[PDB]
Structures are given as structure tokens and as C-alpha cells.
Amino acid sequence: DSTECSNLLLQYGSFCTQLNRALTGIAVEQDKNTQEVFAQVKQIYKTPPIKDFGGFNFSQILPDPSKPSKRSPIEDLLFNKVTNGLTVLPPLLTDEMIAQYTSALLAGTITSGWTFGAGPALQIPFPMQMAYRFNGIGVTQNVLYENQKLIANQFNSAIGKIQDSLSSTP
Amino acid sequence: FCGKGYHLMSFPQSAPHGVVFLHVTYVPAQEKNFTTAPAICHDGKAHFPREGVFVSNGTHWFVTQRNFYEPQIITTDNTFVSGNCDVVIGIVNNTVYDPLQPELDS
Amino acid sequence: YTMSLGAENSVAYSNNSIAIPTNFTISVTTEILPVSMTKTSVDCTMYICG
Ligand SMILES: *[C@@H]1O[C@H](CO)[C@@H](O[C@@H]2O[C@H](CO)[C@@H](O)[C@H](O)[C@H]2NC(C)=O)[C@H](O)[C@H]1NC(C)=O
Ligand SMILES: *[C@@H]1O[C@H](CO)[C@@H](O[C@@H]2O[C@H](CO)[C@@H](O)[C@H](O)[C@H]2NC(C)=O)[C@H](O)[C@H]1NC(C)=O
Ligand SMILES: *[C@@H]1O[C@H](CO)[C@@H](O[C@@H]2O[C@H](CO)[C@@H](O)[C@H](O)[C@H]2NC(C)=O)[C@H](O)[C@H]1NC(C)=O
Ligand SMILES: *[C@@H]1O[C@H](CO)[C@@H](O[C@@H]2O[C@H](CO)[C@@H](O)[C@H](O)[C@H]2NC(C)=O)[C@H](O)[C@H]1NC(C)=O
Ligand SMILES: *[C@@H]1O[C@H](CO)[C@@H](O[C@@H]2O[C@H](CO)[C@@H](O)[C@H](O)[C@H]2NC(C)=O)[C@H](O)[C@H]1NC(C)=O
Ligand SMILES: *[C@@H]1O[C@H](CO)[C@@H](O)[C@H](O)[C@H]1NC(C)=O
Incomplete structure (x- = not known):
């Protein structure tokens, strides 16, 4: 609040404008980064109410209805495990909207495979989608079926091991 | 990486201090529902599509390519046999045509 | 207002139904990428002292 200090500071020119402009560029760049990473779909996809995916369990990655934050158990664990003229600007996308974007991406990739990323979301059964992925890596459909x-048991076990490993490693 | 949709090709254009890529991509459109199955059960054997997918318009079963609707008759030439019908979950019963059958029939 | 992330779309998922495209659109999209800047050189002695 010193007037004399500000009068002497004006002798140095537009240094303060440069610093404010650089910080503003960084601040808008962070929001641009979040848009680039998470906002890649313009449709908010949702999973069907019946979770019949041919034995595949996605409860640890789909949003939990019981939680007010509408986060997955893995996402909830991730959020729990992360702990003079200065101002902190809030991010443009809040955590629930970012979680909603991830939920839309999960619903699209579960119910439609890779079709939603290239155009309209085309529904396909999840075992058939997994068989398509198997063919992508050069393994015949019969092996999957x-x-x-x-395969479903191994996938569920691996997802549980992922949750345990995140909860058990600092 | 090269536009939204299935990438076909791209064109470079010079710009002041920059480049503009015209990405020509293939976007699927006018999708239609079909009833699908993982495999076709015929003669105690399980048939799986070589490159396509089994679809049904309500009464008849066909095999089509995944990214465009082009129904074709389920034959031995576009399907392969692996195992019996007891293992695959959701296998349905349908006939499998044989192109060689009219040749020895005549 | 609070922003809307996207238009709502519920995919009709079921264990035995598939959606197959019957047509296509040839879509051309633009991607602009900067390549170079203006090449600037500053005479340090002339700038500071003339
Ligand atoms: C999918 O996995 C979840 C989590 O492993 C299963 O939920 C468990 O269900 C059993 C029996 O109902 C409970 O004793 C556990 O406490 C549940 N775990 C959690 C984290 O809630 C769920 O049953 C599985 N299957 C389906 C169809 O969702
Ligand atoms: C599913 O497609 C098949 C093949 O196009 C349809 O079968 C044809 O139906 C027409 C209408 O009566 C007949 O004139 C053709 O002779 C049939 N072809 C064969 C090979 O049988 C079938 O009707 C379609 N099903 C539905 C519900 O549209
Ligand atoms: C598909 O065809 C198979 C074989 O014809 C059917 O299996 C038969 O089912 C009957 C009644 O359930 C049994 O008495 C036979 O012994 C079965 N045969 C074999 C070889 O398993 C099957 O039920 C048919 N499915 C449909 C939906 O029509
Ligand atoms: C395929 O079938 C599903 C289910 O019959 C259709 O989904 C319905 O679409 C109408 C119109 O938008 C909605 O009012 C219903 O709520 C939808 N049902 C479900 C379960 O999502 C779907 O539109 C059909 N697809 C095509 C291309 O005809
Ligand atoms: C596939 O979509 C194209 C559009 O790109 C359809 O072509 C149009 O057909 C209508 C009706 O005959 C014409 O009035 C339009 O002028 C056509 N557009 C162009 C760009 O040619 C085509 O008919 C569609 N095919 C199917 C099978 O649905
Ligand atoms: C789909 O689920 C129904 C039960 O809702 C079951 O009767 C049917 O056999 C299942 N089909 C496949 C292919 O899993």
C-alpha cells in the first residue's frame, strides 16, 4: 500500500504487465490442457441400468450412485490419496464435471467400443467388442468366446488388484 | 491424430508461419439396429465370421462387414469352424450354405 | 449459468443387439499448426547504448 514505492516502481516500466500477462497465459493454458484431455466427446454417454456385460464387472470404474460426488471407487481413492498479492484462480472445469466427462468416455467405450470416437456411437455387446479387440491383436474370435x-474373471481380478495396489502403495 | 473419424488421407497447405492439414476422413452414418450373435450353430459345429459379424433383420441371419451394412449369405467361405456349440455363450441355430453342394448335386 | 458438458445421449445397450452403418460421410477437417516464428536478431550493444 506504499504510494512512494509504487511511484518508484513506475520508473521500471511495464515489467509488472509482462509478469501478469505471462501468468494469465499460463492460467488459460491450464484450462486449455484440461479441455484437450477430457473434453473429447460432445455427447454425455450413460451406461444402461442393467449391468449385463457378459461377466465383465466395471463397478470399480463406473460412478458410484451412493456417493454425492458421483465418482468411481478408484477415482474416490485417487482424490483421497492426493493431499501479499497472490490469488488462486479456480479451474474452469470442476472435479464433478471432469468426473462426468470420464464417465461419458467410460460409457462410450463400454457400450459402443471405438465407434463413438470416430462418429456416432454404435451399440455392440461387450463380449463381441472384446472379440474385435482380440482380432486387432491377431487372436481369433473363438479363443475369446x-x-x-x-477372461472376465481375470479382468475383474486385475481391476481389484489395481484398487488394492493403489490403496497399498504410498 | 489425422482428423475426427476413420482417417483416409490428408492434404498439406502452406500458411504464413504455419501449415494447414486438410484431413479427409470416413464417418459412418445412417446406422440401423440388427440382432447379433457371437456364432452360428450348424451340424453340431460353431461357425465364426472370418472378417465380419453375424446380423439378423428379424427372421434371417447374414454376415456383414463391421463398418458398412452389406448382408451376405452365411456360407463356409466367409465363416470358420472352431469347436462345438456347447461352449460359446449365446450361439444361435441357423443353416450354413455350402457352395460346393450344387456342384456334386448336379 | 452452470455449463452443460454435452447433449445427453443414452446408448441403447443390450447383450444381443448391434448397430451397423448403412451409409457414410466423407468429412474434411482443418488442422492449423504453427511451424516457425519471425527470425529476430538484436544488437545488444546498440540496444543498450546506441
Ligand atoms: C461386481 O464387483 C463388485 C465389487 O467387487 C461386487 O460387489 C460386491 O458384492 C458382494 C456380494 O453382493 C459384497 O459382499 C461386496 O461387499 C461387494 N463389493 C463392493 C465393493 O461393493 C458386485 O457384486 C460384482 N457384480 C456385479 C454384477 O455388480
Ligand atoms: C430379411 O432379409 C431377407 C433377405 O432380403 C428377407 O427375405 C426376403 O423377403 C422378401 C419379401 O417377402 C422375399 O420376396 C424374398 O424372396 C426373401 N428372400 C429370401 C432369401 O428368403 C426377409 O424377409 C427380411 N426380413 C425382414 C423382417 O425384413
Ligand atoms: C439348437 O439346436 C440344438 C441341436 O439341434 C438344440 O439342442 C437340442 O435341444 C433339445 C431340447 O432342448 C435336446 O433334447 C437335444 O438333445 C439337443 N441337442 C443337442 C445336440 O444338444 C438346441 O436346443 C437348439 N436351440 C434353439 C434355440 O433352437
Ligand atoms: C435401436 O433400438 C433402440 C431400442 O428400441 C432404440 O433406442 C430408443 O430410441 C428412442 C428414440 O430416440 C428412445 O426414445 C428410446 O428411449 C430408446 N431406447 C433405449 C432403450 O435407449 C434406438 O434408437 C434404435 N436405433 C435405431 C438406429 O433405430
Ligand atoms: C447415403 O447418403 C447420401 C448423402 O451423402 C445419399 O445421397 C443423397 O440421396 C438423396 C436421395 O436420392 C438425394 O436427394 C441427395 O442429393 C443425395 N446426396 C448426394 C450428395 O448425392 C444416398 O442416397 C444415401 N444412400 C443410402 C442407401 O441411404
Ligand atoms: C441376453 O440376456 C437374456 C436375459 O435378459 C438371456 O436370456 C439371453 O440368452 C442373453 N443373450 C446373450 C447372447 O447373452
């Missing part, structure tokens, strides 16, 4: 229960 014959061992579907084993």
Missing part, C-alpha cells in the same frame, strides 16, 4: 468366463 470359448474362454469368456476365464
